[PDB]
Design an enzyme around this catalytic site. Sequence first.
Site, PDB file in Angstrom:
ATOM      1  N   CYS A 128       0.860  -1.217   0.000  1.00 16.37           N
ATOM      2  CA  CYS A 128       0.000   0.000   0.000  1.00 16.37           C
ATOM      3  C   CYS A 128       0.882   1.249   0.000  1.00 16.37           C
ATOM      4  O   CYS A 128       1.766   1.396   0.820  1.00 16.37           O
ATOM      5  CB  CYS A 128      -0.884   0.002   1.248  1.00 16.37           C
ATOM      6  N   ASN A 167       3.974   3.393   3.391  1.00 13.45           N
ATOM      7  CA  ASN A 167       3.980   2.274   4.376  1.00 13.45           C
ATOM      8  C   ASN A 167       4.143   2.835   5.791  1.00 13.45           C
ATOM      9  O   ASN A 167       4.446   2.115   6.722  1.00 13.45           O
ATOM     10  CB  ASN A 167       5.143   1.330   4.065  1.00 13.45           C
ATOM     11  N   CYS A 186       2.323   5.046   8.947  1.00 15.48           N
ATOM     12  CA  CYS A 186       1.035   5.621   9.431  1.00 15.48           C
ATOM     13  C   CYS A 186      -0.125   5.048   8.616  1.00 15.48           C
ATOM     14  O   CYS A 186      -0.119   5.080   7.400  1.00 15.48           O
ATOM     15  CB  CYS A 186       1.067   7.143   9.272  1.00 15.48           C
ATOM     16  N   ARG A 187      -1.125   4.526   9.276  1.00 14.76           N
ATOM     17  CA  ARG A 187      -2.289   3.953   8.541  1.00 14.76           C
ATOM     18  C   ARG A 187      -1.792   3.128   7.353  1.00 14.76           C
ATOM     19  O   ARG A 187      -1.821   3.575   6.224  1.00 14.76           O
ATOM     20  CB  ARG A 187      -3.179   5.090   8.034  1.00 14.76           C
ATOM     21  N   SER A 188      -1.340   1.927   7.595  1.00 14.71           N
ATOM     22  CA  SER A 188      -0.846   1.079   6.474  1.00 14.71           C
ATOM     23  C   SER A 188      -0.010  -0.082   7.027  1.00 14.71           C
ATOM     24  O   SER A 188      -0.354  -1.232   6.833  1.00 14.71           O
ATOM     25  CB  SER A 188       0.013   1.926   5.533  1.00 14.71           C
ATOM     26  N   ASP A 246      -9.631   5.377   0.436  1.00 11.00           N
ATOM     27  CA  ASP A 246      -9.337   6.765   0.888  1.00 11.00           C
ATOM     28  C   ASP A 246      -7.822   6.999   0.852  1.00 11.00           C
ATOM     29  O   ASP A 246      -7.054   6.097   1.124  1.00 11.00           O
ATOM     30  CB  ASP A 246      -9.849   6.954   2.319  1.00 11.00           C
TER      31      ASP A 246
END
Length: 157
Positions: A12, A15, A17-19, A129
């Site tokens: 994704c 890589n 934070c949030r991932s 998002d």
Amino acid sequence: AEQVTKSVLFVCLGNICRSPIAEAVFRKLVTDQNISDNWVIDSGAVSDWNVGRSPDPRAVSCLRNHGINTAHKARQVTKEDFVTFDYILCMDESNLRDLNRKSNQVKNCRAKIELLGSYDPQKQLIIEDPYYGNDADFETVYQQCVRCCRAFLEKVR
């Protein structure tokens, strides 16, 4: 009789934070069921800007506080990670735009590419998002990464 060391690799953009939560999570899921000795889970950035960019100080003390075990470097996924792993999925984001056409230029690609979807539950929940900002929202994502690897470990259990 003889179990197999299944292999999976999440990917994704960004890589950090949030991932990287769904990744360190797959580990805590494969390390709590005599299942860690039969899995090859790794992370995938897909970019070259976050190559070695450890998780942000915000998502670093979180995953390293409840017990996630994160001893791997993001690094940019490579043909080796593709053919190597077999379940190359991603956090949706870029609806299989690159990773999907990535195995095409991979020297012998064998990493089935796909994106998290409805596994345990039965609702259409996708991470389409770009980001969620930074404040007023952060622990919620890390939580959505729990099943990101567990809910998926059920299908490839």
